[PDB]
Structures are given as C-alpha cells and as structure tokens.
Amino acid sequence: ASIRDAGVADLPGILAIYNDAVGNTTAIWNETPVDLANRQAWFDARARQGYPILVASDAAGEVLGYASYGDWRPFEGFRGTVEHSVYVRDDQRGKGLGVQLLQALIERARAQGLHVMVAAIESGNAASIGLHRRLGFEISGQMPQVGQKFGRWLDLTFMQLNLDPTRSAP
Amino acid sequence: ASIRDAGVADLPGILAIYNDAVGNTTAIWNETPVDLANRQAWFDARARQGYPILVASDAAGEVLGYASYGDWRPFEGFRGTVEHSVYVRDDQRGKGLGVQLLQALIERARAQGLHVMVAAIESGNAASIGLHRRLGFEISGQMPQVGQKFGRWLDLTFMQLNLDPTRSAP
Ligand SMILES: C[S@](=N)(=O)CC[C@H](N)C(=O)O
Ligand SMILES: C[S@](=N)(=O)CC[C@H](N)C(=O)O
C-alpha cells in the first residue's frame, strides 16, 4: 500500500472504515454511526487547522486505512500536543498498514513543529499498544472504567511520544 | 465557610479567582484572562448538563472558592466520567476549603449517577495531589511535557476516583 493525503473522494471509504469501528470495535468509544456530511465537516476542520488526514491506498485508489490527529485538550497550554487516530480496514489487518500510517503521521507532526503525540487506547488492545510501543510511544496512564461500550465498562491506556526530546523549552 | 450552589451574583467573585489562577498559577493551563460574559455562558452551560457549580462562602457572602465538573473527553463512551476543577481564593489556603468543596462535589457526582471523577493536576502540585490521595483518588496518569505555561514545559498528573465501584456494568 501507498500513503498519501486524503482527498474529498476518499471520504466515502474513510466513512465506511470509521462506522465499522463504531459498530464493531472498542477502538472508538462512540456507538452512533456518522454520515458523509459529518466526515466532510471533519475533513474541512482538519484542513483549516493544518492537521493532516492520511490514507493507505492502492493503485485503484481504494481506502485501506486512514490516520489523522487533532487537539488533545481544550486549553491553550496543550498546544504542542495532539491526539491521533489510526484506522485499518478490518480485512487489511496483519499487513503492517498501521505501522505505515503511524510512521507517516509522526513525520508530519514533527515537521509541523509539534511536541507530543498522545494515543488513547482501550487497554485490552494489545495489537495497538504494541504498534505504538515499537514506534517510540511509552505508556503514560492506565485509567480503569472511564469508558463504556456494548454495555460494559472499559479501561483506557494512554501512551505518548515526544517528537523533539532535545527541545528543552517551548 | 458554607457550601452552596453558585448563583449569578457569585460570578464576579468566581471570575476574579479564575483570572488570578490564570495569571499566577499552573492550576489552569491558559494564560489569557476571560470576562464576565464568558463565565455567565459557562454558568448556563453547566446547568444545561445538570453539572453543579459550588461555592464556599462566608457570612459576608464572599466567594472564598468554587468547584465544578464537566465532560472529560468528547466521545459518548465517556459519559460516566467527568473532570472536575477546584479553586480556592489565594488568601484562604490552609483553611480546608479545598477538601470541603471536593467532598461536596463528590457527593453531587455520585448522586447524578456518574461513575468516575478525574482530576487533572500539574505534577509539581504536591499539595493538591496529596489532598486528592486522601479523598480516595489514585494516580492514573503521569504525562511529561504535554503542556506549557510561563515559557516552560509542564507535566500533567491524572488522578481518579471510582464513585460506584460495586456497579458491575453501566
Ligand atoms: C474514543 S477513544 N477510545 O478515546 C479513541 C479516540 C481517537 N484516538 C480519536 O482521537 O478520535
Ligand atoms: C488546564 S489543566 N491543568 O488541564 C486543569 C483543567 C481543569 N481540571 C478544568 O477542568 O478546567
């Protein structure tokens, strides 16, 4: 697969992947599916902030997965920190697309001069925790029963990657 | 001091405390002061969500401190979790107002049917972390350099309290 910036034509594929995660996994703690308009607004909001939306695609242009990041917490002081998301279409798992997407995202974040990338992962998702660990992320939090989905409590694991360790001051 | 729900007449007092924290402390990671309208909007927004705003007041009716809570993360799955804030006027420290406000806030949260209360504390605030530890809060996050203020990086500590540990499922 090849990694590139998402275009409007990729939204339908992104939408399908997102809604599949919503209905079948704990990767996203939302149970209500969204529509195209919702993802179009999201697409525009990201462009407005200069934040990237990447997609793993093939020669045909099918969306095999996507990744992006946005603000983490609503306070001026967290401006050097973003929370990202990586979604691989179910049938494309086990092919390293997650690694390709996250590596590309890390490079864009660093190029944008950001300082820290935060990952919010459901604690039982060993596959995701491992992917992040091998890309430099370190566990920074374990928060039990802070979430819920499918009628059960869920635990959240926080991980983070410092994009510029030598930058001792903002 | 007595603890009661805030009213519109308490906003100027709350505004002063908030803005003083903005300019002189690392309790809130914002460096821009707000105006009364901002607080009035916040006041009405909390009421709409059924979230309380409590004030510690004296015989003269002065706001010696205030506390409240709101959503922690923007996803449906976190609806059982709230993030709180507690501010004591700077001349009223050492008078147990923080404990008084937090204990009252905890009871309100439990009564509203919430599952977890989260505190977001600058890691160097030993006093605040100790106060929360004594109220049953446990450390669940330690994130280096995710914030900044006064031209330096700041570390964030997350602490949490399960309000109803016997509730097996949401
Ligand atoms: C919904 S969740 N388990 O907190 C994951 C959120 C995802 N990283 C996002 O930024 O949309
Ligand atoms: C700005 S901060 N250090 O993340 C504290 C935020 C505070 N708990 C609040 O809810 O507004």
DSSP for B3-34 reads EEE--GGGHHHHHHHHHHHHHH-SSS---S--
CB A81 within 8 A of CB A114: yes
Resolution in A: 1.5
The reply to whether B169 touches chain A by the CB within 8 Å rule is: yes
DSSP string covering chain B: -EEEE--GGGHHHHHHHHHHHHHH-SSS---S---HHHHHHHHHHHHHHT--EEEEE-TT--EEEEEEEEESSSSGGGTTEEEEEEEE-TT-TTSSHHHHHHHHHHHHHHHTT--EEEEEEETT-HHHHHHHHHTT-EEEEEEEEEEEETTEEEEEEEEEEES-TT----
Closest C-alpha to B54, from B41, B44, B63, B42: B63
- A146: closest CA of chain B, how far (Å): 6
Cα torsion B8, B10, B12, B14: sign: negative
Ligand 2: does its nearest atom lie under 6 Å from the Cβ of B51? no
Which residue among A75, A79, A158 is best mutated to probe the pocket of ligand 2, counting the most ligand atoms within 8 A of its Cβ? A75
Site to substitute for ligand 1 among A49, A68, A85, A123, most atoms within 8 A of C-beta: A85
- Rounded CA-CA distance A124/A153 in Å is 12
Q: Is B169 exposed, middle or buried (0-12, 13-18, 19+ CB in 10 A)?
A: exposed
Residues 110-129 of A with CB under 8 A from B: 115-116, 118, 120
Annotated binding site of A: 73-75, 83-88, 94-99, 125
Distance CA A106, CA A104 (A): 5
Inter-residue contact A89 to A62 (CB < 8 Å): no
User: Closest by alpha carbon to A53, among A5, A121, A109, A88?
Assistant: A5
**H helices present in chain A, as ranges:** 11-24, 36-49, 97-111, 126-133
- A53-57 and A63-71 as β-strands: parallel, antiparallel, unpaired? antiparallel
CB A87 within 8 A of CB A103: no
Q: How many helices (H) and strands (E) does chain A have?
A: 4, 7
One-letter-per-residue 3-state SS of A94-109: CCCHHHHHHHHHHHHH
Distance from CA of A68 to the nearest CA of B (A): 16
Whether B66 and B46 have beta carbons less than 8 Å apart is answered as no
The answer to whether B136 and B161 are in contact (CB under 8 A) is: yes
User: Domains in chain B, ordered, with CATH?
Assistant: 1-170 (3.40.630.30)
Assigned token pair, B77: 């799955």
Distance CA A54, CA A65 (A): 8
Which letter does DSSP use for residue A61 in this model?
Answer: -
Q: Are B154 and B144 in contact (CB under 8 A)?
A: no
CB atoms within 10 A of CB B31: 14
| Contact call for residues A64 and A56 (beta carbons, < 8 A) | yes
From the CA of A29, give the closest atom in ligand 1.
1
- Do A132 and A121 contact (CB within 8 A), yes or no? yes
Amino acid at B107: E
3-class state of residue A21 by DSSP: helix
